[PDB]
Amino acid sequence: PVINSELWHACAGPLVCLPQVGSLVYYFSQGHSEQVAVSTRRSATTQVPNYPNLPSQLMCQVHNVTLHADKDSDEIYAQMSLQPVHSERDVFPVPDFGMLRGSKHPTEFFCKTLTASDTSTHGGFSVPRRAAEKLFPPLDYSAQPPTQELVVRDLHENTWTFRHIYRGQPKRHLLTTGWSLFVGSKRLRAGDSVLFIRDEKSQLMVGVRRANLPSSVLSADSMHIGVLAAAAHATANRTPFLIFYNPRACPAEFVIPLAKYRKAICGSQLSVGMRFGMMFETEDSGKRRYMGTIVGISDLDPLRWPGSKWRNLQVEWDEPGCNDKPTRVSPWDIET
Amino acid sequence: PVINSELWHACAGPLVCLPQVGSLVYYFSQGHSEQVAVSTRRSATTQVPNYPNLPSQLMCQVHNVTLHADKDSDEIYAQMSLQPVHSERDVFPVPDFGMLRGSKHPTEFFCKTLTASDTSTHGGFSVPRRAAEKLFPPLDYSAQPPTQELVVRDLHENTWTFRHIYRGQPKRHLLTTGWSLFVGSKRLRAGDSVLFIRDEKSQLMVGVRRANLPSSVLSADSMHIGVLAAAAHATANRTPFLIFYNPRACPAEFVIPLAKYRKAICGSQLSVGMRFGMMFETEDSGKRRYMGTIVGISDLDPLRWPGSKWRNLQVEWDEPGCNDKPTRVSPWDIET
Ligand SMILES: [Cl-]
Ligand SMILES: [Cl-]
Ligand SMILES: [Cl-]
Ligand SMILES: [Cl-]
Structure with a gap:
């Protein structure tokens, strides 16, 4: 079962643009360490060793990009397989990578921070007018309550029906029946965000961000050392290495398309x-x-x-x- | 609040004997990788690099040993801080480490795999006679049900009362009221084990083992590379490095007291x-x-x-x- 790219992108954030598979990139070990320090709540120690062969910007070719989400936490991240290239000899031509699809955000979507009343037992989820009119099917406003049921798919392949109702003084678009089940089941709180999109197939989907436990496999230091050593060992042998990018936890993208780097640097x-x-x-x-x-x-x-x-x-x-x-x-x- | 060493040891297993703080040990990078492969469900890849300076057995001094437990999973492990020593110059004398306590198993204890009836809503937990007579206070066998309440402490500082009753045809020692609350709260199943001990302070404690999710910070390979690189970098600089040992997941101890190594090797x-x-x-x-x-x-x-x-x-x-x-x-x- 295949993870919804657009909902993944909606959840990731509007500024997130991943490297295409088969493309050249620069990998910034310092950006990597920054993402690891966030995840580790502790920064890259003074001791991490010198790797003379590991440059601050390591040209790689993207062997693979895959998209992941956790079903209980709603954590999302991408795994990229990067091979450092030292000459044209190291570079797989782009067709060798087969058909690629774009990494695009859905053009029809909305996102809201949950209020206190969005999460209260009664009260329901308030939808802005324009968002309800763009994302939901048109209501019969002559019905004594105008109302419909929306079948919504989450990022984890689960389906949810929400009752969409138009009522109140003043009239408001609300999600009522099924909303509180979602909030309960996913343990959402005020401050968290919820997002609705239509994907390319015109599927109505829903995504979640959560507002604001250490590894007991490897020390924080060793993880920081491993980041550096994996890249240095991949550089020496020109072998693929696999990085994780969590766009909600990562302070700045550390895998930078060559085209993006050049526009910013070489010409400027x-x-x-x-x-x-x-x-x-x-x-x-x-x-x-x-x-x-x-x-x-x-x-x-x-x-x-x-x-x-x-x-x-x-x-x-x-x-x-x-x-x-x-x-x-x-x-x-x-x-x- | 300080983690109960004896209950930790009871949970760890009868054969577990940790290095004393201040002591010399041999650290076996291969044993480390083995523990990491278990945790990673994937073995140490062929590519992990050569570290000519990292011997298969690395003499260290133990700077520190601390004991940890997770309150939701009941995972336990120890963190050891090891400094590689290349000459007597690298070796802190043992007094510099202050007072140390032994790593001892409690002499009064019992452990049982949970049955189906140990976990059923009625039925209660059956305790073997000898275990009830050794670990619980003596019952008044003249009472119409012989019965008492046991106040039991878990590894996470939580207290639980269990009703201990002696009844049935034939008579059996059982834990009834409060037992099912424990089983429910901790999500225990048949196959899991439960252990009761008296600690050095004669405190009645209870521990749990569970019978039979990947990191999204670092790749499996990088974690394996980091294990090796942290040890090699600590060896070069004679700096402390921190290892984790999970005695329920670790196939064999990889931090071996010098005294134990010598008895087995040098004389033999x-x-x-x-x-x-x-x-x-x-x-x-x-x-x-x-x-x-x-x-x-x-x-x-x-x-x-x-x-x-x-x-x-x-x-x-x-x-x-x-x-x-x-x-x-x-x-x-x-x-x-
Ligand atoms: Cl460096
Ligand atoms: Cl360039
Ligand atoms: Cl090696
Ligand atoms: Cl020796």
Whole structure:
């Protein structure tokens, strides 16, 4: 049974764009370690060894990309198989990878943070008008309650019926019967998000994000050492290595399409003082451009990773707000 | 709040004997990988790199041993901090480690596989006579039901009262009220084991073993590579590295006290044709000696680990039974 790519993408976030299979990429060991530190709640220790043969940006070809979701937690991540390429001799032509499909977000969707009344025993889930009119089939507004049943599929192949009703003073679109069963069964709370989409097959699907336990196989350090050693050993032998990317836990993508890297680096010219826009995901899974200024250009970590493009742009924001946005970003993160 | 060492040891198994803090040990990277393969359901890949500086038996000093248990699963394991020592200069004297306590099993205990009637809504838990008389306070056998309430502590600091009753035709010691609450709350099934002990403080405690989900942080390979790289990097720098040992999942101890290694190796003399006894844990957490014959003495893995003492004795058993016992063992596993 095959995992729904679009719902996976809706859940992943609007800015998530995965490398295509068969494509060249740059793999940034520092970005990898960052994702591991999040998962490990502890940062990459000072001791992790030197790998002289492992560059800060390792050109690979994508052997495979697969999409995963956990049925109890709703954790999602992609597994990518990357082979480092040192010359054209290391590069499988793209046809050798068979037919590929795009990694696309659904164009019809909505996403909402759950309120307290979305999760209360009575009250139901309130749907915004435009979302109900775009995503649900049209109601018979002459019915004494206008109402219908929606059959919705989740990312784990389970089906759920929700009663969709239009009532109240003022009238509101609500999901009632079956909604509280979903909330109960999945242990959703206020603060979590729920998303509805139509996929390419016009299937009505539903996805979940959860707001805000250590491994007892390997120490945090060994996991951090293993990240580095697997890449260094793959580089030496030109063998495939498998990375995981969790787009809800990962602070920044660390597998960067060559085309994206080139547009940002090779052609461009960046300076301290420069103005720039960076896209951020918004609460309803939209995108919003935030402006700032480059205030420095320098190595994130001059000792371990000299000259690394990873997070080498020190930036300040026009609207810092709660000091939400990162103080360092990478050249491929900005537009101008 | 401090984890009960004896109950931890009762749960761990009768043959489990951990290295003392401050002590010298040999660390067997191959044994480590074996434990990781169990946890990973996939074995150490062919590709894991050569580490010329990492010997098959790495002398370390034990910096620390701590005991852990998971409250939902009842998984238990120990974390050991090991520093490789290359000369006497690398060795902290033992007093520098402060007061140490022994790692001892409780002398008063019992363990039972749960039956179907141990887990049925009625029926209760049947306790063997000798176990009830040794572990529970004496009953008033003149009472119309002889009965008492036992206050029992689990490994996670939770308290449980069980009603202990003596009734039936024939009379049986049973745990009734509160037992089914325990079974329900902990999701125990027939096949799982339950253990009761008195600790050093004469506290009545209860432990659980369960009969018969992959990491999405790091690939199986990287975890296997990390095991090797952490040890090799600790060896080069003489720095501490932290290993986990799960005694219910680990096929053989891979951190071997120097004293145990020496008795088995340095003094001894082993031959093909030789008879030997090896201890195995029994169902009621007793120990049973099994006899066999050494049928070969040779490297487990001559290519990657030449001359390694790890699982270098090929053995046949007097009673193979279901082909339960390992076909290779290590010199420190046998007596003669
Ligand atoms: Cl490095
Ligand atoms: Cl380039
Ligand atoms: Cl090796
Ligand atoms: Cl020795």
